[PDB]
From Swiss-Prot:
Gene3D superfamilies: Green fluorescent protein. It comes from Aequorea victoria (Water jellyfish). Changing residue 103 to S: In alphaGFP/cycle 3 GFP; improves folding at 37 degrees Celsius, reduces aggregation at high concentrations, and increases the diffusibility of the protein inside cells. Changing residue 149 to F: In Sapphire/H9-40; exhibits a huge Stoke's shift, with an excitation peak at 399 nm and an emission peak at 511 nm. In Azurite; shifts the excitation and emission spectra to shorter wavelengths and increases quantum yields compared to BFP. Changing residue 153 to K: Increases fluorescence at warmer temperatures such as 37 degrees Celsius. In Esmerald; leads to brighter fluorescence. In VisGreen; leads to brighter fluorescence. This is Green fluorescent protein. The gene is GFP. InterPro entries: GFP (IPR009017), GFP-related (IPR011584), Green_fluorescent_prot (IPR000786). Green fluorescent protein has been engineered to produce a vast number of variously colored mutants, fusion proteins, and biosensors. Further generation of mutants led to more stable proteins (at 37 degrees Celsius for example) with brighter fluorescence and longer fluorescence lifetimes.
Length: 236
């Protein structure tokens, strides 16, 4: 709304109100081709996302929780005193590319590339995923992950070399037996547009995710409620 920085204004004006979201993923893990479609809504005011995802090719070949991070950080709530650090909104509506390599300890990797942009009044997340070197008897392809997710903090750093950001963070996936599977994430984001973006000072995003199921849905699916809040810069 009312921010003294016109560049902040431009970003926030796009994300006042509830914004419909479409997610498309095409994936290939160890010779298993699959497609995920998701729909829902984001509200950056509260840093809230509600998404339903379906596997449109049948049974998802990997555990759903392994895809949470891959399946829109522009819906993060940035407090008022941190809005000048919100790279994700500044890049809109033209969008940004989000690339990751995800290493599952003692197992294979995912390589993802995503474009996040507005198509009309809809925020679209278009993802390609390639997973290689997974063990058939491992926790991933053997479906030994629990269906739940753990809160955590992701550190965001500017990359002034590429007018973007980078992040490296670990996800810990609970395994059936009470162990954990670590998933080491490396991420970089770069704008699609040539125009200026807001390059953040170092800060973190605090993420909460709750996974559930739609009792009426017979297709392989995941319902995701996610809260993301920016923090780590104090109103001094």
């Amino acid at each position: 709304h009312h921010h003294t920085d016109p560049m902040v204004s431009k970003g926030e004006e796009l994300f006042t109100g509830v914004v419909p979201i479409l997610v498309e993923l095409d994936g290939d893990v160890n010779g298993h081709k699959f497609s995920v479609s998701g729909e829902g809504e984001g509200d950056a005011t509260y840093g809230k996302l509600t998404l339903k995802f379906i596997c449109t090719t049948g049974k998802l070949p990997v555990p759903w929780p392994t895809l949470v991070t891959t399946l829109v950080l522009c819906f993060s709530r940035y407090p008022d005193h941190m809005k000048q650090h919100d790279f994700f909104k500044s890049a809109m509506p033209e969008g940004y590319v989000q690339e990751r390599t995800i290493f599952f300890k003692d197992d294979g990797n995912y390589k993802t590339r995503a474009e996040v942009k507005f198509e009309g009044d809809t925020l679209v997340n278009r993802i390609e995923l390639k997973g290689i070197d997974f063990k058939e008897d491992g926790n991933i392809l053997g479906h030994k992950l629990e269906y739940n997710y753990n809160s955590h903090n992701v550190y965001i750093m500017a990359d002034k070399q590429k007018n973007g950001i980078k992040s490296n963070f670990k996800i810990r996936h609970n395994i059936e037996d009470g162990s954990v599977q670590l998933a080491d994430h490396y991420q970089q984001n770069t704008p699609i547009g040539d125009g200026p973006v807001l390059l953040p000072d170092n800060h973190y995003l605090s993420t909460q995710s709750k996974l559930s199921k739609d009792p009426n849905e017979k297709r392989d699916h995941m319902v995701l409620l996610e809260f993301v809040t920016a923090a780590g810069i104090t109103l001094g």
